[PDB]
Design a protein around this ligand. Structure first.
Ligand SMILES: [Cu+2]
Ligand SMILES: [Cu+2]
Ligand SMILES: [Cu+2]
Length: 439
C-alpha cells in the first residue's frame, strides 16, 4: 500500500455523511505484532470523516463493547443535546448522532468516548478517529497544490496481545505507552512528492505530549484546534498537548531524509523513590526523545510561496463576565479538582448566557501540566503564563504548565448542559471536570 499509512477516509455524499460505526474489540496487526484493540470501524485509528460546512452528519454508533460508551465530537461547536457528555449507550445498543456542520467552521477535529470514569481505558485501547471540515480556503493555490496528510499522534502499550491495563500510577499521571505511533504505524516513512506539505496533526494520546520538531526545518502553523490562524506563523517547534490539533505547512528546503521528532518534554509526571527510610514522590523528568516518522524530500524541492492570509478572526463582542477556575491535585490519591471540587454530573458549576462572551481565567495550581478542554464553545486564547498569544484562532484545549494562568475569551454558543475538563483523560475520570449550563 502507500508508504505512508493514513486512516481510510469516509466523505459526505450529496451533503450527507450517513455511517454506521461499531465500537468493537478487533484483532489487528499493529506495529508488526498482532493485538486486539478496541476500534471504530474495525481500524486503528478509526476512519477519518471528511465533511464540509452545512453537511448533515448521521453517525449511528453500535456499542459492541462489554461496557457502556458514547461519543464526544471533540471541538465541534454543536448542541450538547447532540454532543451529549452524559449519554450512555449500553452494551449491544446503538445511538444515532445527527447534526449539521456549522457554516463558519474549518479544521481538524476528532471523536472519542466521553463516559465519565471509563474514558482513559477506552481511549487508550484505540477508540478514536479524526473528523476533517473542508473549507473554501483549501482551494487557494498555496494550499491546494500542497501535499496533504493527517498525522494521528497516539501511543500504545501492549501486554499479552491487548492494551496494557491501567496501574494506580497511570491514574495519577495519565497513561503513556512505549509504542509511539503515527496513524497506528511504528515510525512510518513519508516519501514526499511535493515540496510543500500540509500536515493536519492530532494528539489523540491519553497523556503523552509531542514537542514536535522537524530536523533542519521550521513549521508554519496555519490552524489551531478549531480553525485557521489569520496568517501563517513560523515556529521552530510545536507542542501538542493531549486533545490538541494543529495544521502546519512544511517547506522542504533540500533533498534528503529528515526526522520528525517528539523532543524531550517534562509534563510533571511523577514516580516513587525509596532512598532509605521514606518512600516519596519524585519527578519522572523529561520524556525520552522519540522519532515519529522519517520524511524523505523529493528531488530539487521548490516549495510554494506561503499564503499571505488565511482567515480573519471574528471580532468578538465585549465580555460580560469573568470566571476563575483553579486546578489542583492530590497526587497520592490520584484525585484532581477544579475550584476544590470533583465532578458531579448532578451539580451545575457555571451558568452563562448564550451569545454573550465570557473571560475564563484558568489557573493551574498543580505541579503537572494540565490541558484544559471546554466542550461546545470554542475559545480564543488571549494569554498563558502572562505571555500574550502570538496568533488569533479558535481553540478548545489549552495547556497549562505548573503555576500558569490562561486567559480565554469564551463566546457562549449553543444552549444546554456541557462540561469542561482536563484532557489528560485519567484526570477527568478521577474528578477534574465540571458542568457549564448555557441558557
Ligand atoms: Cu477530546
Ligand atoms: Cu470532553
Ligand atoms: Cu490534568
Amino acid at each position: 500500500g502507500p508508504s505512508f499509512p493514513e486512516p481510510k477516509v469516509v466523505r459526505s455524499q450529496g451533503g450527507l455523511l450517513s455511517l454506521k460505526l461499531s465500537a468493537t474489540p478487533t484483532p489487528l496487526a499493529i506495529a508488526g505484532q498482532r493485538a486486539t484493540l478496541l476500534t471504530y470501524g474495525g481500524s486503528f485509528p478509526g476512519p477519518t470523516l471528511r465533511v464540509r460546512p452545512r453537511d448533515t452528519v448521521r453517525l449511528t454508533l453500535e456499542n459492541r463493547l462489554p461496557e457502556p460508551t458514547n461519543l464526544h465530537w471533540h471541538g465541534l461547536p454543536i448542541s450538547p443535546k447532540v454532543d451529549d457528555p452524559f449519554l450512555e449507550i449500553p452494551p449491544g445498543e446503538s445511538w444515532t448522532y445527527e447534526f449539521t456542520v456549522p457554516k463558519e467552521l474549518a479544521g481538524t477535529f476528532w471523536y472519542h468516548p466521553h463516559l465519565h470514569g471509563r474514558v482513559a481505558p477506552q481511549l487508550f485501547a484505540g477508540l478514536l478517529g479524526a473528523l476533517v471540515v473542508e473549507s473554501s480556503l483549501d482551494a487557494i493555490p498555496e494550499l491546494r497544490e500542497a501535499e496533504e496528510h493527517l498525522l494521528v499522534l497516539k501511543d500504545l502499550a501492549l501486554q499479552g496481545g491487548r492494551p496494557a491495563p491501567h496501574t494506580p500510577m497511570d491514574w495519577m499521571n495519565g497513561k503513556e505507552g512505549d509504542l509511539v505511533l503515527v496513524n497506528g504505524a511504528l515510525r512510518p516513512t513519508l516519501v514526499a512528492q511535493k515540496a510543500t506539505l500540509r500536515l493536519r496533526l492530532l494528539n489523540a494520546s491519553n497523556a503523552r505530549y509531542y514537542r514536535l520538531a522537524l530536523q533542519d526545518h521550521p513549521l508554519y502553523l496555519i490552524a489551531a484546534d478549531g480553525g485557521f490562524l489569520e496568517e501563517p506563523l513560523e515556529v521552530s517547534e510545536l507542542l501538542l498537548a493531549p486533545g490538541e490539533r494543529a495544521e502546519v505547512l512544511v517547506r522542504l528546503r533540500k533533498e534528503g531524509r529528515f526526522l520528525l521528532q517528539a523532543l524531550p518534554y517534562d509534563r510533571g509526571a511523577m514516580g516513587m523513590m525509596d532512598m532509605g527510610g521514606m518512600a516519596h514522590a519524585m519527578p519522572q523528568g523529561p520524556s525520552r526523545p522519540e522519532t515519529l516518522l522519517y520524511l524523505i524530500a523529493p528531488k530539487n524541492p521548490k516549495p510554494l510561496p506561503l499564503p499571505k492570509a488565511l482567515s480573519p478572526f471574528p471580532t468578538l463582542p465585549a465580555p460580560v463576565v469573568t470566571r476563575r477556575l483553579v486546578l489542583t491535585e492530590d497526587m497520592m490519591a490520584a484525585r484532581f479538582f477544579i475550584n476544590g471540587q470533583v465532578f458531579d454530573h448532578r451539580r451545575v458549576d457555571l451558568k452563562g448566557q448564550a451569545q454573550t462572551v465570557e473571560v475564563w481565567e484558568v489557573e493551574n495550581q498543580g505541579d503537572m501540566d494540565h490541558p484544559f478542554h471546554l466542550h461546545v464553545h470554542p475559545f480564543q486564547v488571549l494569554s498563558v503564563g502572562g505571555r500574550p498569544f502570538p496568533y488569533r484562532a479558535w481553540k478548545d484545549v489549552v495547556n497549562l504548565k505548573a503555576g500558569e494562568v490562561a486567559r480565554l475569551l469564551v463566546p457562549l454558543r449553543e444552549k444546554g448542559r456541557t462540561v469542561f475538563h482536563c484532557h489528560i483523560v485519567e484526570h477527568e475520570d478521577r474528578g477534574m471536570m465540571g458542568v457549564l449550563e448555557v441558557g
